[PDB]
């Protein structure tokens, strides 16, 4: 007799998916929903390269640590790469105020230019601007931060100083400075020629008075002294006024910046490359339209949702019965 | 199978049918061959393509950054930040695994339904002109050339033309 039969497809596929009723079902065709591979390198996000701090921390980079002279160049980045435990930060020991907040503010900046807010030669006629320290050594020589000046007395005097800066740059200007706390009154008289000093930093919305705290304290980086670091964001059209009769670590270079909200800092040991991506992880970068990944929870930008799943494969074909 | 065809009364699949998901196998004096049903295969491809597009493209991702830093007097806020991150990862993991499990069962049910529907379509066309073997096959009570087979597959099969010849063979048996 003559026969016609109804049947269905089969192939050599070894794909397996999981279903509600049965696990590990072999199927003819399937698609993967889970990205589980990276390229092991750092790529451009949003089209622009990231800032590699290398050996430095954000604290060392933004203050101008003598061992970070190579990082001053760049003025554009999308995210920041920092070593897990950075070796070069605040070479002179002290408390960096609101440091995490500052790292969040600097997480991404579209335009970022450095300019000498108080020129070293013109701004301090009656103060010594050459102060250095062995804790901030560069090439076996005592140095200091590039963006700060250690003001000490000249001709046996530390006169009252008053210095203002008006932000005419039509962008937020980041100003950093410091206050020095000597270990003993003797060092205080030698450096600033006074026992009671004060530092005042005020703007239209900022106001804080600093008083040196002289005490003996454990040696950090071979220094019993301390320099507390401070910062403020000066809005365009606003003035910041520095008044001090001692202990001020004055600003030399400031930063006019324009933000790029939503980015951040990653801790990675992965090398750099010229690739581009919408997603980058500390392990490496990722592509694909896949809506899920299990590479790393810490992502940057628009990334597939991280899931702990080891496998997310949905069937499109039939049960494979060859 | 939920509809009883795949791994049911049609016990196996055909590696010989490369052209489609569902199709036919015919045996007559002229020849033997595997043929694919392009209409029902295309419908299944369209539906499952839209199913994949739905799962993938409902997931819209804004440009964001998970990582945050905290000092030693901010432990409660660090743990609150950790509770947020772990909590969303918990939910999306559970949603993704459950979604894939359930919709994989529905997708295999879907093929079972399509095969069953194609078998009933042919059975509704042949009527008494053929008898059901039980394995997804029909045995014609009349002769059926390659043009007659192509009418069964195209759904343009004509019942009256072969009805009288089928009745005589059915009466003989």
């Amino acid at each position, epitope marked *: 007799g003559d026969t016609i039969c109804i049947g269905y497809h089969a192939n050599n596929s070894t794909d397996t998916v999981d279903t509600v009723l049965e696990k590990n079902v072999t199927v003819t065709h399937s698609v993967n929903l889970l990205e589980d591979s990276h390229n092991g390198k750092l790529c451009r996000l949003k089209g622009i390269a990231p800032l590699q701090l290398g050996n430095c921390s954000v604290a060392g980079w933004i203050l101008g640590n003598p061992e970070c002279e190579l990082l001053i160049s760049r003025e554009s980045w999308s995210y920041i790469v920092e070593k897990p435990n950075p070796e070069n930060g605040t070479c002179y020991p002290g408390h960096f105020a609101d440091y995490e907040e500052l790292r969040e503010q600097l997480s991404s900046v579209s335009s970022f230019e450095r300019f000498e807010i108080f020129p070293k030669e013109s701004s301090w006629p009656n103060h010594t601007t050459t102060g250095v320290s062995a804790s901030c050594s560069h090439n076996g020589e005592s140095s200091f931060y590039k963006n700060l000046l250690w003001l000490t007395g000249k001709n046996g005097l530390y006169p009252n100083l008053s210095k203002s800066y008006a932000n005419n740059k039509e962008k937020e200007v980041l100003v950093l400075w410091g206050v020095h706390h000597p270990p003993n009154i003797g060092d205080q008289r030698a450096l600033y020629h006074k026992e009671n000093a004060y530092v005042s930093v005020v703007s239209s919305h900022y106001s804080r008075k600093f008083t040196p705290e002289i005490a003996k304290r454990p040696k950090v980086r071979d220094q019993e002294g301390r320099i507390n670091y401070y910062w403020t964001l000066l809005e365009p059209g606003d003035t910041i006024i520095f008044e001090a009769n001692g202990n001020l670590i004055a600003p030399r270079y400031a930063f006019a910046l324009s933000r790029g909200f939503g980015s951040g800092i990653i801790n990675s040991n992965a090398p750099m490359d010229e690739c581009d991506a919408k997603c980058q992880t500390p392990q490496g970068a990722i592509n694909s339209s896949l809506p899920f990944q299990n590479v790393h929870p810490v992502t940057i930008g628009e990334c597939p949702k991280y899931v702990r799943s080891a496998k997310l494969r949905m069937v499109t074909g039939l049960r494979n019965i060859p | 199978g939920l509809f009883g065809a795949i791994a049911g009364f049609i016990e196996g699949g055909w590696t010989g049918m490369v052209d489609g*998901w569902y199709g036919y196998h015919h045996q007559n004096e002229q020849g033997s061959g595997y043929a694919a049903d392009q209409k029902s*295969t295309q419908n299944a491809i369209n539906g499952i393509t839209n199913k994949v597009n739905s799962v993938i493209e409902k997931m819209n991702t804004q440009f964001t950054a998970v990582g945050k830093e905290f000092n030693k007097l901010e432990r409660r806020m660090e743990n609150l930040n950790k509770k947020v991150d772990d909590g969303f990862i918990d939910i999306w993991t559970y949603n993704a695994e459950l979604l894939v499990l359930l919709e994989n069962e529905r997708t295999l049910d879907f093929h079972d339904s399509n095969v069953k529907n194609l078998y009933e379509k042919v059975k509704s066309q042949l009527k008494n002109n053929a008898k059901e073997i039980g394995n997804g096959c029909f045995e014609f009570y009349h002769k059926c050339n390659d043009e007659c087979m192509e009418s069964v597959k195209n759904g343009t099969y004509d019942y009256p033309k072969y009805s009288e010849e089928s009745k005589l063979n059915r009466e003989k048996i």
Partner: nanobody
Amino acid sequence: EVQLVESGGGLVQPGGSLRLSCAVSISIFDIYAMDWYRQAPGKQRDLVATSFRDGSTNYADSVKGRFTISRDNAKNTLYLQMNSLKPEDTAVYLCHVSLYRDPLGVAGGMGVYWGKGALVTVSS
């Protein structure tokens, strides 16, 4: 398995006309897309024309207005009517078929087949 056999390939003088035909062993009525590719020595494969199930047509800029693709459902044949031929149109023409519309590779790209080819030479 589906067989595609081209025919009509030969040499032709410029300004002439030629029709190529492609014979499919399986009914072409429900086939999603049927294509003509051309390949010249030292060149890549180029999409020349495409016919779709709905009756739509897509042509490359180079052959547009001079070439016409059409399918004869009854003869299971795909035609490429080439008019106003130029010497640059010299190529080996390839018949391609795609049974289904599968943008996401859902069905693994099944139902795609290639013809053997037919040489068209425009000279003198």
